[PDB]
Design a protein around this ligand. Structure first.
Ligand code: HEM
Ligand code: HEM
Ligand SMILES: CNCCc1cc(F)c(F)c(OCc2cc(C)cc(N)n2)c1
Ligand SMILES: CNCCc1cc(F)c(F)c(OCc2cc(C)cc(N)n2)c1
Ligand SMILES: C[C@H](O)[C@H](O)[C@H]1CNc2nc(N)[nH]c(=O)c2N1
Ligand SMILES: C[C@H](O)[C@H](O)[C@H]1CNc2nc(N)[nH]c(=O)c2N1
Ligand SMILES: [Ca+2]
Ligand SMILES: [Ca+2]
Ligand SMILES: [Cl-]
Ligand SMILES: [Cl-]
Ligand SMILES: [Gd]
Ligand SMILES: [Zn+2]
Lengths: 402, 401
């Protein structure tokens, strides 16, 4: 029998038949669960590509057709003579969508089918890589009306180095290790900040200094690239009724563009394939601004609110956090930048699970990442039991290139 | 082999070496992780042996004197009966261990101070009800809560079990209406109609304290009404929103779970109620704001003059905070022990640090340690955890029908 999952709010029961098709293996054994840990080729390449090809011909309802037959044999032959193969442009488009659809920690998969795939498999240098990124940013930002997108740079192949983007996201704020042990700016970006300087960049001294891009072309050092300021949409944060809030001088960028995972399709590995959608307000308001080890503003906002930060039973942390989230949602809507609050995001996610159950009979979901970082049990995914597993195509974590 | 565990807030690293002694098997496989599911699913000498070894090493009387004799004592008892009797001191230690080993409990910093009430000499349901009321009075203590557990007779072969049919000792009723919905606590719809089927005459309020359905071996259960001066309750009011008290909301003081089986040394106690004191989110977020419980959130939001027709006003977040503020203020007013999730999580962090030095790790189920509001504002959000089952432990068990 398959895992039986319960929804507690509604009382309903499903079985995840899909998890039986899980390819790569995860960290949990019957002895102990590790589901909370953040970071846990000839004939096996064939059986991966074969499985992918079948996936592609199932999607279009033409499985077993002569063309499906022929493409499998076509892939079998290219693997024999070269050791690898190339995806058709259609298989790449469907592949990238599959990788998003399968990402178990992403709460926005209701949108997985509307994804703009930019094919950069012919990219030749770091200079063409920057050109391609700017086009991505331009297209996805779209002057505030955000459009999901991914750009796929050339696949890993033996003999040659990988294309890589050393930056973890396309838009990132500098983190200047302050001399007194602290940080001015974003502390998550202290190491990449040190690398940018060392690689030629003249640092600022603000707190929302946009980092340049380090782009590395195969078997080359990374080259330094500055984003055009008008290409990088930013939102100053102000609060609809707390008017001193604007004097905090808080800003955040419009476009979340993850640039350092590996996209894996049919056994082929793309080390550089940045993707981007639109923000959920709690990533900005709760995690990026209030995490103790991020901008950590939550005490400073509460003191401004005249809360009693002396005892925890006033729930000043909770009150100041809510208001910082109100400000994000309001400032982004004022600027007419796409954004989704965690109640909308999680309710649409429940619709995705219902779709995926009709469609594939399951959906890999990582509870600790789907449940938002405030107001958890107030959203419907709290009460939803989930099964976590690894399907391919997938986005995967990969070592930092340095 | 030894899971590496990281605190992302600090950057600290430890290795859980205690996980290797995982007595049982949980629900997860290399293929799929089920750590989000609420319930999964002679050789007694081995479990019995292993518990005694824990005991004596625990009091530093390791594998020596009274150790070697206790071993051959229980071997002989099981040879003659099929089962064996715990020493009372062992009983104390296995209770505190079972609490210490419960991975979903954030309150384990308190695992040293626990009041064990030996009720193994208990026969008939009227003695049950007496044993229960002493417990309730001892633990309520006029609002200064003291953790405690009473242990009723263990399961033995060829026999019947002592069962408290009630999931908790304090449970508000839940009457179904011909309009399909519920007046009261929906969680308790099934127990309420059992109280009625087996005798009780129903009230009609949103907070009618149920009767107890206590059951003796090979006998049906009997209702027992609790004396209302024993069941300490807290009317809920808000420190500044004067209208809150008029909503008529009220919770009880003593969290007392009465339907989990206790396991010690291969012995199973199908009736052993335990109690501590509440963490405010249990009442204010889960019991009152969960869509399938009292589900009061939208009522408070309306009274608060909040914009309830667009999700981005975070009206749900604001109304939930104030319901918690009301809980924390109403318990302090009545001098009833309560703890907020910020204090409770910071204490659980200390307990991890303790347990790292004492036992080399600590079984913890992240989904249940992290509070259900302001998750990432508490320090246990940023702490990787390892979940596993050690014995002694508390286990869920099937209902007696
Ligand atoms: C369109 C709006 C989208 C929203 C609102 C959204 C939401 C989220 C959120 C809240 C997370 C958790 C991030 C964290 O806290 O670490 C996440 C993770 C993730 N997202 Fe999405 N997402 C969107 C689009 C996309 C797209 C277009 C892709 C890829 C094509 C994608 C792939 C992923 C992956 C692989 C992860 C897991 C990576 C990680 O968090 O370590 N998402 N998403
Ligand atoms: C300081 C006192 C205590 C606090 C603050 C506390 C807090 C909590 C919380 C928040 C939970 C999760 C609630 C849930 O799962 O719905 C829990 C669960 C649990 N606790 Fe504690 N608790 C305390 C005392 C105790 C005692 C005295 C025992 C046993 C002797 C115990 C054993 C357990 C068990 C077995 C669970 C299982 C959760 C479940 O059944 O769903 N706790 N505790
Ligand atoms: C402190 N949190 C961890 C930061 C973090 C690390 C990653 F590796 C991510 F992949 C990520 O995803 C962010 C994201 C991506 C997309 C496409 C949409 C969206 N709404 N959010 C966030
Ligand atoms: C909707 N959630 C499920 C409700 C629930 C189910 C159980 F089976 C429990 F065991 C439990 O125990 C909660 C508890 C126990 C003690 C002794 C102290 C404390 N503060 N909390 C709560
Ligand atoms: C240690 C803990 O698992 C870690 O901080 C995770 C938990 N869940 C999360 N969930 C989301 N969405 N984002 C995160 O960064 C995290 N962090
Ligand atoms: C599906 C999910 O695991 C389930 O709702 C859990 C999550 N965390 C919880 N945490 C606590 N404290 N109590 C609960 O009942 C739950 N329920
Ligand atoms: Ca070709
Ligand atoms: Ca009717
Ligand atoms: Cl981010
Ligand atoms: Cl409760
Ligand atoms: Gd104002
Ligand atoms: Zn697991």
């Amino acid at each position: 029998k398959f895992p039986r999952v319960k929804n507690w709010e509604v009382g309903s029961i499903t079985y995840d038949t899909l998890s039986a098709q899980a390819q790569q293996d995860g960290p949990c054994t019957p002895r102990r669960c590790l589901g909370s840990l953040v970071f846990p080729a000839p004939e096996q390449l064939l059986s991966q590509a074969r499985d992918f090809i079948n996936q592609y011909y199932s999607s279009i309802k033409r499985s077993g057709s002569q063309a499906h037959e022929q493409r499998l044999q076509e892939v079998e032959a290219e693997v024999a003579a070269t050791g690898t193969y190339q995806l058709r442009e259609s298989e790449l488009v469907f592949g990238a969508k599959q990788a998003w659809r399968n990402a178990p920690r992403c709460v926005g998969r209701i949108q997985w089918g509307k994804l703009q795939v930019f094919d950069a498999r012919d990219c030749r240098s770091a200079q063409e890589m920057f050109t391609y990124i700017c086009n991505h940013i331009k297209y996805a930002t779209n002057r505030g009306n955000l459009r999901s997108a991914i750009t796929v740079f050339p696949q890993r192949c033996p003999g040659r180095g990988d294309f890589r983007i050393w930056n973890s996201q396309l838009v990132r704020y500098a983190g200047y290790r302050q001399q007194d042990g602290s940080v001015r700016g974003d502390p998550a970006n202290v190491e990449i900040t040190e690398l940018c300087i060392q690689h030629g960049w003249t640092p600022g001294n603000g707190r929302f200094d946009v980092l340049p891009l380090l782009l590395q072309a195969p078997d080359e050092p990374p080259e330094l690239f500055l984003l055009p300021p008008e290409l990088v949409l930013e939102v100053p944060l102000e609060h609809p009724t707390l008017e001193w809030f604007a004097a905090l001088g808080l800003r955040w960028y419009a476009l979340p563009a993850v640039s350092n995972m590996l996209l894996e399709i049919g056994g082929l590995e793309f080390p550089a394939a940045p993707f981007s959608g639109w923000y959920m307000s709690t990533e900005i308001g709760t995690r990026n601004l209030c995490d103790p080890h991020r901008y950590n503003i939550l005490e400073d906002v509460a003191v401004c609110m005249d809360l009693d930060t002396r005892t925890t039973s006033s729930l000043w942390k909770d009150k100041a956090a809510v208001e910082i989230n109100v400000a994000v949602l309001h400032s982004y809507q004022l600027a007419k930048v796409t954004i989704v609050d965690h109640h909308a995001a999680t309710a649409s996610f429940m619709k995705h699970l219902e779709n995926e159950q009709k469609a594939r009979g399951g959906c890999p979901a990582d509870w600790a990442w789907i449940v938002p970082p405030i107001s958890g049990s107030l959203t419907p995914v709290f009460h939803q039991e989930m099964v976590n597993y690894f399907l391919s195509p997938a986005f995967r974590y990969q070592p930092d290139p340095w």
